[PDB]
Amino acid sequence: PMISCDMAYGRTDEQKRALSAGLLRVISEATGEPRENIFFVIREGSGINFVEH
Amino acid sequence: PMISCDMAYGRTDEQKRALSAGLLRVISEATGEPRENIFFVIREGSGINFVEHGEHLP
Amino acid sequence: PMISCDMAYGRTDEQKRALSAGLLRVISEATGEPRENIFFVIREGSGINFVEHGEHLPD
Amino acid sequence: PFIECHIATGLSVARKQQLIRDVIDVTNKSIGSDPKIINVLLVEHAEANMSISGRIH
Amino acid sequence: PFIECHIATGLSVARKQQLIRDVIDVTNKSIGSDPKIINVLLVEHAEANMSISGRIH
Amino acid sequence: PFIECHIATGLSVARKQQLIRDVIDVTNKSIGSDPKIINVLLVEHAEANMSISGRIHGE
């Protein structure tokens, strides 16, 4: 699997590690693929670069 | 819906507001979906990171 | 065609040129599309932003 | 630039081609990019494969 | 945020729906995002179209 | 790294598999990545759904 998250800049390295641990677990459990088989990238930007509702 | 735009650094805040507004409007009209149902992200990079017409950008 | 590469910061412009030349050649040859029709973007991030083989990358 | 748009399945081919045309137009008019350098990718998905604002279809 | 997940085809509709529910929950718990700004796209692919760990299917 | 390739539908499965092999090799040779951490995704689209350089399929 390959997972990406585009999100506002500002989260701590600890929060990012929590994010990845959760996403890796849930994707791994749903697909049945080992955590080592799931790639994850976080892409960050400032607020002018996001329109969220 | 979800919209992303990968482009070079340098656009003004005014230009990015025009872009997001123009994009959300056309996607909303095409899909019947309200503007609030449309995620948008701009992802910026420097010239070396883009290859257009087979050449890296300045 | 449109190609993207998400990778860790740190590659030189020379490496990025090698990478693009190689990808455009292989995609063009596989696809039958001219090189000028193949858009390529590289997206860079710091180590904490990547998880590969189960672990966040160092810088 | 490269604009990638993810929408639900259900539009006609005509409508989608008009959408692409209009994306190119608005990108040109607001950030100033020549149509010659604008790339657009439209991808359609089943509603079940998308969550807008934490909502499950 | 926008979380895009590329997985192999093969899951039930029920399983994918749970996966989207689980992605939303995890995102909210870990980085504090209101589910109202959490957007999820699940994309399925043939195994031949993907390589993980350099492996050709 | 993660390479995502968007191309037109029309390639055979054999041809697609070699393309993926070739992307992995190009990436390893240019950027140094262990092939085991090079992830490649190939996505095929109808021509009508892609515009390169402002062009509309047909016209």
Side-chain angles (χ1 to χ4, degrees), chain B:
Chain B
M2 301 86 177
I3 312 179
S4 69
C5 170
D6 282 81
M7 67 181 185
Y9 291 117
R11 258 46 76 127
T12 68
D13 289 4
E14 213 198 305
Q15 285 181 308
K16 294 184 181 183
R17 290 180 205 119
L19 184 63
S20 58
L23 263 24
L24 262 56
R25 176 181 81 248
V26 329
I27 277 64
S28 176
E29 194 272 13
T31 68
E33 205 91 44
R35 289 178 58 106
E36 293 77 22
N37 283 6
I38 302 159
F39 176 91
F40 179 55
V41 59
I42 293 167
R43 293 179 201 117
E44 302 166 301
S46 64
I48 193 71
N49 291 336
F50 292 82
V51 186
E52 308 196 350
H53 306 94
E55 295 295 326
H56 288 256
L57 286 179

Side-chain angles (χ1 to χ4, degrees), chain A residues 9-51:
Chain A
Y9 180 78
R11 252 65 77 220
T12 58
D13 288 3
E14 273 298 292
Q15 288 181 305
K16 298 184 180 170
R17 302 199 93 105
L19 180 62
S20 85
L23 260 10
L24 263 274
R25 185 192 90 258
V26 300
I27 284 82
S28 188
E29 196 182 282
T31 70
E33 230 97 75
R35 274 156 158 267
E36 319 86 278
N37 286 184
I38 297 156
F39 171 87
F40 183 39
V41 63
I42 298 161
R43 301 170 198 117
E44 300 165 285
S46 78
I48 200 68
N49 301 307
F50 290 81
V51 185

Side-chain angles (χ1 to χ4, degrees), chain E residues 6 48-51 53-54 56, chain F residues 17 20 35-36 40-42 44:
Chain E
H6 300 283
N49 288 59
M50 298 182 300
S51 77
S53 289
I56 276 300
Chain F
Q17 296 177 137
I20 293 170
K36 280 201 188 151
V40 181
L41 173 61
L42 198 166
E44 307 169 77

Side-chain angles (χ1 to χ4, degrees), chain D residues 4 6 45 48-57, chain E residues 16-17 20-21 24 35-36 38-42 44:
Chain D
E4 173 172 12
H6 297 283
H45 309 272
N49 282 42
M50 300 188 283
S51 180
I52 324 319
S53 302
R55 297 194 297 262
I56 300 286
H57 182 65
Chain E
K16 293 194 310 278
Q17 174 204 107
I20 295 161
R21 214 177 296 279
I24 294 158
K36 285 182 133 116
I38 301 172
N39 302 271
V40 184
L41 207 226
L42 186 48
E44 305 167 77

Side-chain angles (χ1 to χ4, degrees), chain B residues 8 45-58, chain C residues 3-5 7 11-25 35-36 38-44, chain D residues 1 37, chain F residues 26 30-31:
Chain B
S46 64
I48 193 71
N49 291 336
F50 292 82
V51 186
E52 308 196 350
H53 306 94
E55 295 295 326
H56 288 256
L57 286 179
Chain C
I3 305 172
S4 63
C5 182
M7 66 184 189
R11 277 31 105 112
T12 62
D13 294 3
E14 305 90 286
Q15 285 174 294
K16 292 170 177 177
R17 292 178 183 277
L19 178 66
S20 76
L23 294 176
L24 267 49
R25 175 192 16 260
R35 287 168 191 173
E36 296 75 26
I38 303 163
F39 166 95
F40 179 51
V41 55
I42 292 164
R43 298 178 197 116
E44 294 176 281
Chain D
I37 74 175
Chain F
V26 164
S30 55
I31 250 66

